[PDB]
């Protein structure tokens, strides 16, 4: 109901990210059907933390911001959804800092968000899963799990 403040931080956020963003990472505002920018819907990418079985994979997620931003965190959704205990089958990511009623702050910047999500991949919160598959494999056969992750990283490696 009041996106004037939103499109404003999304603009300085768009700047801050350009002056210095993490390697291999991608975060850019989509283009409206007319041709003008849209700081509301963003297309990003996170490359697997080197050394982890996510290494070499490029994981694309969408960042949708409400008219509430920064009062509220954005909704980060992996496109396509990923095999991971804290990622819903819809693609949505379940991270503590992306919940307004939790560790979210308007201070939190995009770079901080994509990085938090990068970390969440190797170190999942299995205490509270958002998906059954990743969870089941993780608890029952932790090795098969890692194998699944590596195959998923490869599948998302730049071709």
């Amino acid at each position: 109901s009041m996106s004037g403040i939103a499109l404003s931080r999304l603009a300085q956020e768009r700047k801050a990210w350009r002056k210095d963003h993490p390697f291999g990472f991608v975060a850019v505002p989509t283009k409206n059907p007319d041709g003008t920018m849209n700081l509301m819907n963003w297309e990003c990418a996170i490359p697997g933390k080197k050394g982890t079985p996510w290494e070499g994979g490029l994981f694309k997620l969408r960042m949708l911001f409400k008219d509430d931003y920064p009062s509220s965190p954005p909704k980060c959704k992996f496109e396509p959804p990923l095999f991971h205990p804290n990622v819903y089958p819809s693609g949505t990511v379940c991270l503590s800092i992306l919940e307004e009623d939790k560790d979210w702050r308007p201070a939190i910047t995009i770079k901080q968000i994509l990085l938090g999500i990068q970390e969440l991949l190797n170190e999942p919160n299995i205490q509270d899963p958002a998906q059954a598959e990743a969870y089941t494999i993780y608890c029952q056969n932790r090795v098969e799990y890692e194998k699944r992750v590596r195959a998923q990283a490869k599948k998302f490696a730049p071709s």
Binding site: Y88, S90, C94, Q127, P129, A130, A132, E133, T136, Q140
Partner: protein, 156 residues
Amino acid sequence: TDLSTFLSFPSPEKLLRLGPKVSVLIVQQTDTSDPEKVVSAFLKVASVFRDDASVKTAVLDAIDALMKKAFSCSSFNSNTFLTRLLIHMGLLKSEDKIKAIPSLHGPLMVLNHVVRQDYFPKALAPLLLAFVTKPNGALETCSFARHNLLQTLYNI
């Protein structure tokens, strides 16, 4: 007509009243191709389960009819079924943030039976195992039904 009043307020009595054809009715007045649908009919009927020979027979037969047909329909996706099921039983959180059923003794008594049946796709066992065996989940104690289920599941 009358089956609709049973689904609005499940009851072991209302169930018996539907008559000898609850098996056929449930299977008919239910879209057995929509996972969310079947889950609702499952949980509801399952909340009416009880040890009384009269009722117990009725509830497990209805479920057998419902799930047998459901797991058979190619279009029906068992994984969504399970997933949504775990959701409604409050074992697996969700995005819609759906309000979980009140009690879990009924579904757990029925799940043991269901899982022992042929119509049940065995590749679902471990997923169910993981959440029924999740030590910190909604399941907070030494349940009786929980033990049989679990035993059956590892045995699979």
